[PDB]
Amino acid sequence: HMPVFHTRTIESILEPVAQQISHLVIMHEEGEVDGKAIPDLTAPVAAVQAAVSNLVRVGKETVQTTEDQILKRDMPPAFIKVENACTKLVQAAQMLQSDPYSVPARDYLIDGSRGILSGTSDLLLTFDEAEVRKIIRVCKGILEYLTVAEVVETMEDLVTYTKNLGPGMTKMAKMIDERQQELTHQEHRVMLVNSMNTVKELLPVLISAMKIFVTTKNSKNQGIEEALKNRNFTVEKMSAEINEIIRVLQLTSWDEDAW
């Protein structure tokens, strides 16, 4: 009970039935709901059976398309779970069909419904993790390029650097913004927003520092030490914030084989 919904999307999908089931689990250990005859679900159940097959199909396709190795190994197991719990639901239906007061058939409905719900969540979680894993890479990439900042000594380089980092800094910003907007734990969202913003505010600051540097370089006018410090400090603080973001992201999207 009370799942770990990470994004609003998933929750808006699982929350409904997750409740219809939780409100029912309470109707067993302390109530044992049993009496009302259940009309043949040969139809309604069919509705789920069909959607389950469709789901499984898409997942099998998602595996072929995907490149993430964890997904190719985590999803397949989920397919079965949703398919297995579904055969149970379908059976529990024909059971009630012949006998609407069958108690055992009532059990098949619950166990099968929770199985389908759990099998689904696992599928969505896996997928989400892969998505997040895509962001971490992008983040790890920006981190790396910030390292090259200390190699730029000419305006020609500075121009190059800016044209490469800028686009990157945008993709990450886009991914981060589109991420926090889905997060459900207001706690993690604050860290992401503040971090990303701080990083966006430092970029222009980084460039300027580098510019001032390359300017002092080819110029009789001494005073270049303090320039390297500001540039270096920016990278350091920027890097800190990015490492912060990565971490917050890995809190739930991490697996033993994260390669």
């Binding site: 999908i13 699982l14 009309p39 409905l109």
Partner: peptide, 22 residues
Amino acid sequence: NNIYKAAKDVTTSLSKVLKNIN
């Protein structure tokens, strides 16, 4: 994307199934 679409279908059709128990 298309994964979230199918997922809802599952939960939707399964909602109208459990609803007939309350």
